[model samples]
Target: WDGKIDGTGTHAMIVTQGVSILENDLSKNEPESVRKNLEILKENMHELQLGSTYPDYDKNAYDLYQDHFWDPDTDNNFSKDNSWYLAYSIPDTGESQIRKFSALARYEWQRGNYKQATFYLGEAMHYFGDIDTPYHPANVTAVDSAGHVKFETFAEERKEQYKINTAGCKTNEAFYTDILKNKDFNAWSKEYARGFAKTGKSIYYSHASMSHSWDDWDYAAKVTLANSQKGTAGYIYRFLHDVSEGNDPSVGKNVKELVAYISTSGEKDAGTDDYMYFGIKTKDGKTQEWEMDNPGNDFMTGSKDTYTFKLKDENLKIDDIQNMWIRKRKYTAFSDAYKPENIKIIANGKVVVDKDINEWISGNSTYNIK
Candidate 1:
């Protein structure tokens, strides 16, 4: 029941580093109160670990062990279903402890007890970390589960490799909404747990007899570790942002603006009278489309133009840009063929796409910018 990792490091120590990384990034722009609370949390991080490891040792509750494991396949019921309570001795599948500790953290913060608040927050974050681990949410038992122990040991030994850079990671809108606005920890926790369980289960079954070496599981281990780190950082940030007096809209969100440059070929009649449009595809399969809003017909001959498009969707991160396409409408037979000498797109202060696309967009054809 101890939350120690391979008998050397504890879960609290691992999660503390993750929270510290986020605090370092957020201290730059966060309000003084938020920064001070983060410092307080940092000072008490060791004590925070006590909360994370508490559920494991608490023997009074019949479901204390069940509280540590959640089966994503069978535990889809987020509500307080009586069947789950009667069968599993818990109200909800796995998120009940997260909800319990989250509420306690909020209560303590409201009462001006910062230390107590962080302790409870740490307790909640432990469940977040547990759900992200392949063994926890998948309900993988520890008995003879060498792969589970090996994975935990590997992650702990190389934990520094999985820290996420807040500035560089992709934005998740639904996650932000859950913690920031809705305070729906259950919703996001379940969603992330399901995803991690899928990957964890695959690795577990495939490598059941194998050595469970770094080569076979590094990718999945890194993913789970990074996810756990990100989730911990997010919960801390949400709590600080909520308690702070001043308002900073950008504190918990990463806003991405995309600016594209298109150079029209100078060839004779290369300009097109047809309407030109562009679409941006994200990694999550969401597409944003925009039409050339020009006073005169777009794609004019020998002209270089700049177009700015903000991601209208809230919480979409800059790193989510996957593929971009430019197409022209075939309005009339007389519509001139348009060729672009180059295309450039910049987002989140980085050039995500820069290519020399010296290609012709004839008729209703579309050109994908590499």
Candidate 2:
């Protein structure tokens, strides 16, 4: 959601732009398609009717990235995996159902339970797919009081659709989340179709009315927005009924492991602002006025207007301290190679706590300095 809006939306699809090159270029780098290999391996295993496929596994390069792809410690286009996971929260934040389901898919897939595995895979895909909109990558910049320009992404549209319902029945976002939360996805087909229909807008409409305007996805978005706001759009999905349960016996042990890893693993910026704040005084009944010349990041979280508080700090005194300007924060990168050995552990690394023990766990979790 690089550039979305609080009440509006952004104008770009950052993920599509970043991942397009990657998903495309890496397609031809392999000998056999992953799906094809899975099929052959499953049949072979069934004939042998073997157990514990640990021996048949062959490690293939996930070599899409040069090194440490999806490293949580670093910030890169590849890091979108985490972003997707985080965005998955849009659907349901009750439990890590989406995460667990993704893991279950891996387990089934590894065991050669292709059909069953796919059931869960679809769930995982939905989690990621929820965040893919052209508005997600739009860049934004607007003027400030001091006549300076400010740039930032607003994620309002993304937030609104998380609770989108396509069944045509009205509901609230909270209700949608409640319905999905911890609910067994035993009915995937029913859910997915419902999700896609929430858009309410048709591609044909975009082609005709909006002339396929990228920024103008708004053409169709309005209908979806209304329905979503009304809470009535979750009837378009249907559950998968095919039966190929991931029980193939010919899968390699490594493949099984990958399946398992996928089952369990497959898991899921910024700051700055400055401004010249001044104090003004008036006659008889003293009234301080702002000159309107301000600049910098909107660090007050999301307080773009003065409406959240009273103009006078004393008059606004109620709860929590509020500041005038936003601050720039530091970002840290995570690395996995050539790390030094035998580093001691500390709960608060900066603090000299004698009880702190340097352990393998921390190293394994190594990330940016932050």
Quote each prediction's TM-score: 0.52, 0.22
Quote the positional error of residue 211 for candidate 2 in Å.
2.9
Which one is best on TM-score?
1
Give the residue spans of candidate 1 off by over 4 A: 5-10, 27-29, 63-67, 73-75, 78-92, 136-150, 157-213, 245-370
Best by lDDT: 1
Task: Give a tens-digit lDDT track for model 1, residues 1-370.
Answer: 1265222244665457556656555635446787787777777776677676555443322222333445656556433234322211213334444544665565566667877777777777777676666653333435322223546666667666765655233223454434566433345545655675556556555542134655656676666666666666776766676666532222333433455667777788766778777777888888877776544345677765555554545477655667888878877877578888877664432234658867778888878984
Kindly report which residue stretches of model 2 are placed more than 4 angstroms away from their true locations once superposed: 1-183, 186-190, 197-210, 213-217, 226-370
TM-score of 2: 0.22
lDDT of 2 at 288: 31
lDDT of model 2 at position 63:
12
| Cα distance off (Å), candidate 1, residue 208 | 8.4
Q: Where does the lowest 10-residue lDDT sum fall in candidate 1?
A: 83-92
Global local distance difference test of model 2: 0.25
lDDT of 1: 0.58
Candidate 2, 49-81: lDDT as tens digits:
111111111122121211100111111221233
